[PDB]
């Protein structure tokens, strides 16, 4: 149930634990994850978390495999200019893509179709193939430029799922609020939530 | 610095801690608060927090005054159909209004101008007087209907400030994330801390 | 089983209560769980157009409809118009499909604007944000531009505008044949067999 | 009271009983009817009804006069390419036009101004002369293409009256539902109703 | 996997080899094909290929069955005015439709909802049923009218797949470029590309 | 002689490098001055799809392309992606026409929004503000609504959207026949003869 | 009177003298300036003026401090990828921003919200905080793409102040025409002369 | 090369030197110029320049002929209500038109089609005949009203060439900046320098 392969992209918005928690749940659900991360997102993760993420893909692939307890080849990391990567072509891309968190800059590039890196190209491919594309922005306030880009992508089928956790399950910690959004993302993708 | 009188409206979106914390900070900054709350918001607050507000405005005004340690007359509560309340007319309304949290239904009514209660009429008055109007929605995902209503109000001058706390100050508790959004609301209003 | 397991069926104050009752009956015989909602105006419509004595409060209404359709225990669930704890009010718990049959012009407007003033309008707002099937069955003549604009906007967002306009190419002999035509299209739109 | 000359066009939408019943009431109300019918509507009438309609206008005029009990010359039938017919020119056209039923193709042609036959040209003339134009579509569901065509024409003054009969007069027959829509059409035209 | 019944329409754009190759692949995948072809497309196939396609539907069905080695009844050909054909109604139409190649005229008619023939009506039905509709245009340059009609249909859920083959598999023949587009069509429909 | 004397030919990272190489060859045989631009992604596409070993640096690239097409001295001029002093970057010095072939969806987006992040996008922006012919040759399937919206906006402003969609009504026998079809349409759009 | 801290960004449009003259006037008005400059704007300044700025921010800060005679810490230069710089976040950014001159590319990125460097991110922050954002484009002719981006930013509150000096004070030198535009920028910001 | 006859209209925007310099270069390029000037532009020229322009057309034609050294009949001046003038009809109008400088009012009238004087009617004729129409506005800041009028006209084929001179040719005088804009107008029209 749900997509077997998911492209997980992390961009330079605040909330790196949303993406790390989502990656861990996708691994526990035994899904193949094509992991992409921007240069700004690597700076965010080093600023907000105690996760020492390696810079190059191969070292990053081995780190995240140990960090999540993933099986061999379950996590695949690709550089930001690796156009030969599966997510860059329609016939080879995973059946679903999540950008979590999604910076306002990546939200702008996906809305305009800039395709300046692998993350933006993979989102452009998901839209032209009409595959699930979930964007998780973190920004306050939302400008009209942010809202216009979100509305345009939402009108085209993309799911605008902001990092706005709810409080109606009486959260006790920061991780409870992170798990709220992550479960919302798995719910949108059609993947069970074994928290 | 900042508005002396603020209309604080709470509607039936999740995140009643945001509005309670914002009310407390406005009281600590010695601002006069015209407090409004919807029926659905009262149930949200009783569901998510330990605060069950008295229903009638006078008993609700005494509760919030004790809850926040406010001075006499600093917090003024008005019913949802009290059109004689200050926030309902342009000449008497407080010069700033915040809907925190702002449900998708209240976001709908403000965008269309429904004015079916005092909260929606007060937001309509704030727009026609071109006074600060801060909306704090809590919803995931945002549908195109939600985004269209936010974009229209954003284009008209309202500040769309979603309940999306940041993590770049390394929060350690739920209260740190609530304080993140409340601090952004006060900065939007021009109020210290 | 093919199609939605659980369906939110909302009846609003448009004429054509026979459409909603016949649809509820067919959904029960196809062994679907139905979360039944009804407005105050629709209760007055059913008392005016039909001889069905529908109880006013939910618990008595649930027992009446269970006996009316011959449903199993718990197959039909009735919720009040302000029951925000009902499953259809939240995305995580809502049924995976919703039908508003019949759909008044007032409910059509509220769903198009997102008013969320009752459980019916909030459930439709949830179905749109979760991108789940939302079928609207309006009954009105003529269609003003306000009606058509609200229908077009919801049609552009993925909702299915299925007006109560039965066809005659199966040579109907009774009013029930025309009622069954519209109900058959609703079940076909949802992906549910029709006998 | 009301227009004394009516252009009645039938196009290939289901519900030929609506058009035949409307023609019958217009004859009973002593109105002159300029009757037009498309090739697809002739196939619909033969499929849905037991009415054996002749193919070309002169025989069709004598049949409809006998079928409706009309006076001599009360009904005038014109071919689909008779550009010399009154409804094709502004000075000579009847000052009211009804397309009942109105197919999605005719609804599209009127909205775009195709003027490919006498029916579409007559509707184009009615719009440029600011004369009443009533369109009775029969389709379910309404696509966004259908709704935008209806919205554009309704914004221009045309009346979009879908074949959506009401049930608040407690109908007991198919003919009761047909008379509901016909009565609304006459009500829109300002013509009295008399069952 | 994928739809079992396909409506394959060929219109008067250049690239008849695309449609013939797609028909052959759909047959090899054991899919039932409802084949439609316009008069202009018949002239295109006679001009670009040496396939002698019979004009009448019954002889065309026997030819295409022998041309692709299809089973009995696997290919069903319907005339351009056969409104009784399955693709003309929502209840009976195949669950997916492809127009390959798609003329600028057919692209125009589908965008406006002209429904002047079976091909245009079947596409209009696919849109109101929200079933897959893949359009394969062949035109250069694309005018603003072409792009506006493509954008409107793409915004409604139709897949605009232009006959623009890629070269990144290093093609050696014209057939390699034809297979590139056909493979993209099958992948869009969710059908394997074993062949 | 008819048509523009100087043409800016830009190749971006869309599939179909044979289209641009064939167009450059035809413009050279028609004795046109070509200001050749190429993106880093297009250099990867050419190395992947063709057996053409294109040098990376501009001056070594200009010598290779001059010998590849048999051009005269100075007929082909190659400029780096950040060479803002290049003629195509300014309205007074830019060539009379510009062709982006092939045109990636990213370059199509940057021209539609006016990003001007490299010389190719800046040259296209200059061609639009001077109202000079701008031909875009996209290669993508399917076309998303984002692609179509960017194409419609540029087409509405005067740019020629010429997709890499070759026709079959001349009964082609090879891949190059289909490549020559698209190139001939580009030359017809520019007003240049096609005695290829 | 006027903002005490201003973000001054220079992008690769012609007219580097406008930004240098504006930076000088802001320094003489005792304002704190968060100076940002693009790679292309450095090439423009070296082409049109006698000023070739040191590339790194620290050496550029000392050069501009000596060039304008600024006090210690009055001018602060930040790199194009310094996301920790004050202008990149709403709570810490200066309350006014000027992009002078403003390239057609930066005008494009601010209109779409590209946020690809610190300059474009700072302008995006200024718009979401509803703070003064002044864009000074230099281009001729204006294409419809340029005008569409300017109209969108103008409709959102940004001030489109093109480098189009007037002649009604009868200028006698290039410096008089530069001072015309700089005077209008300061008047737009509420800063005297 | 380029149009043989050009309609040159001067309206009440600042920058009369642009129009006078453009008229001079069109004469040196042996072009026939149909010169039009608004009453507001006559006041701008008297304010910004030392050029004593006569008020009525025939004396204005003789002055401009001697000011530019034009041949006999090369410059033809027409009044603001001379509807029989060549530029007022499509069959008789010159092949190209330039409004330099272009006031915001004339920009508005051309965008709406007011045709209240010969200048506005001539621009309306140029658009309906699809002939080159160059507008040179001088205004700062550009309001959204100005930008919307410019965008509509540019979408219709008109060239919006603002009086924004560049500095990349290192100008040494006001005349160098004037010559920059004039050179771009001539290059837009297809006329050499
Ligand atoms: C003292 C501290 C820690 C201060 C932090 C101040 C800010 C800006 C906080 C919020 N925050 C943020 C935090 C941090 C640590 C960094 C490095 C960057 C951001 N940015 C800016 C983007 O990265 C920038 O726009 C890239 O250009 C995107 O590139 P890409 O799309 O990833 O390729 C951002 N963006 C967005 O949208 N929402 C956001 O909350 C933030
Ligand atoms: C086995 C059976 C009974 C099959 C019938 C299946 C269908 C499609 C039923 C509904 N139905 C219908 C019925 C019949 C009998 C025919 C011949 C045609 C239609 N069509 C198609 C149009 O005629 C077509 O689109 C012409 O091209 C319009 O031409 P024109 O405007 O009249 O000139 C239609 N259209 C529309 O809108 N609503 C509608 O309910 C129907
Ligand atoms: C413990 C459980 C199971 C709780 C259910 C949680 C649900 C259903 C959603 C979260 N949540 C929410 C929580 C609770 C407790 C209640 C009572 C209501 C809401 N609603 C619905 C609105 O109140 C409704 O739409 C009123 O009609 C608005 O009226 P008003 O504008 O205030 O006057 C809501 N709305 C919105 O936007 N974002 C939101 O997160 C929520
Ligand atoms: C007997 C009866 C028949 C009605 N018929 C219609 C109808 O056909 N269509 C419609 O839109 N409204 C109809 N209405 C009016 C609606 O009920 C009314 O607008 C109401 O406000 C709808 O509220 P709801 O959307 O909560 O049901 C009818 C009302 C009654 C009592
Ligand atoms: C040999 C031939 C090739 C054609 N090529 C194209 C083409 O590539 N694209 C296109 O849009 N039309 C092309 N046309 C024109 C269309 O056939 C024409 O517009 C026709 O009206 C389409 O009708 P249809 O949509 O019913 O097929 C071609 C026609 C012929 C005879
Ligand atoms: C071998 C290869 C083939 C590609 N095919 C296409 C294509 O057909 N269309 C497209 O838009 N992009 C294609 N891409 C992706 C683009 O190169 C990518 O979007 C890049 O960002 C474009 O940058 P540019 O516009 O500067 O060339 C391809 C890339 C590679 C390496
Ligand atoms: C000397 C020089 C002068 C330039 N003049 C202009 C100009 O007047 N207007 C403009 O929009 N771009 C001009 N450009 C081009 C821009 O620098 C180029 O588009 C660049 O990508 C802008 O990058 P930025 O927005 O990061 O500064 C000029 C470039 C150079 C090197
Ligand atoms: C000395 C002077 C300078 C002016 N400067 C400008 C200017 O720079 N831009 C502008 O749009 N209008 C300017 N105006 C105002 C216009 O002249 C005024 O709007 C007038 O109505 C324009 O009329 P016209 O379009 O018929 O010339 C100026 C006026 C005067 C007298
Ligand atoms: C004590 C009284 C009479 C109060 C008046 C109440 C209202 C809503 C006045 C309208 O105010 P406005 O004109 O819309 O701003
Ligand atoms: C011999 C005659 C009377 C021919 C008239 C036929 C038509 C359709 C004229 C156009 O009429 P209009 O000007 O568009 O209203
Ligand atoms: C020293 C040199 C060659 C400077 C030219 C640099 C540029 C790109 C000028 C822009 O020109 P434009 O006015 O925008 O058309
Ligand atoms: C041999 C390889 C790795 C080719 C990669 C192809 C790419 C990057 C895009 C084409 O894919 P699409 O046609 O746009 O879906
Ligand atoms: C007697 C004469 C020559 C009068 C001049 C004609 C005018 C002023 C406009 C007609 O011109 P147009 O038809 O609109 O292009
Ligand atoms: Na790019
Ligand atoms: Na409400
Ligand atoms: Na038709
Ligand atoms: Na840029």
Residue numbers in the entry:
A (entry chain I), D (entry chain G), E (entry chain F): 2 to 196
B (entry chain C), G (entry chain E), H (entry chain J): 2 to 194
C (entry chain D): 1 to 195
F (entry chain B): 1 to 196
Direct quotes from the study:
Originally thought to be redundant but distinct decarboxylases, it has been shown that UbiD is in fact the only decarboxylase, whereas UbiX produces a cofactor strictly required for UbiD activity. The UbiX enzyme catalyses both the N5–C1′ and C6–C3′ bond formation to generate the fourth ring of the prFMN product.
This compound contains the required dimethylallyl moiety, but is twice the size of the DMAP substrate. PaUbiX appears to be able to form a geranyl N5–C1′ linkage, by virtue of the change in the UV–Vis spectrum upon redox cycling in the presence of GMP. However, GMP binding could not be detected in PaUbiX crystals, which we suggest is due to the presence of W200 that likely blocks GMP access to the active site in crystallo. The corresponding electron density obtained from reduced PaUbiX W200H:GMP crystals confirms formation of an N5–C1′ bond with the geranyl group. The lack of activity with all but DMAP(P) substrate (or GMP) confirms the first step is an SN1-type prenyltransferase reaction dependent on formation of a dimethylallyl-derived resonance-stabilised carbocation.
